């Protein structure tokens, strides 16, 4: 439900999709990154075949880590239209409002396809 991505799958997962994906780059020993894992997961539940929800852990692949500018956990970002300029998510941490987010993300994505 949630998508392990890692540097080896980044690229045909999300960068080459034209779904809405959102990211959470993570650490393990992180304490907030350990109390987002059930809320990431309802909310991947949520939007099943809506949104494709994703996760990195930028603790072991600082490749991907450095890339988006993660210098602390967790960092949350959605990938719409333009997956080389990723938007930075600070809504709340629970699957409900990063719902919210996604569908108001959905929302510019379709309207901007529109014209």
Request: charged share 25%.
């Amino acid at each position: 439900m949630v998508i392990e991505l890692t540097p080896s799958n980044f690229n045909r997962e999300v960068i080459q999709s034209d779904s809405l994906w959102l990211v959470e780059f993570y650490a393990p020993w992180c304490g907030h990154c350990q109390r987002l894992t059930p809320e990431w997961k309802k909310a991947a539940t949520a939007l099943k075949d809506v949104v494709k929800v994703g996760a990195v852990d930028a603790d072991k692949h600082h490749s991907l880590g450095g890339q988006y500018g993660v210098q602390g956990f967790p960092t949350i970002k959605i990938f719409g239209s333009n997956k080389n300029r990723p938007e930075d998510y600070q809504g709340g941490r629970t699957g409900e409002a990063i719902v919210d987010a996604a569908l108001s993300a959905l929302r510019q994505l379709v309207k901007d396809r529109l014209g």
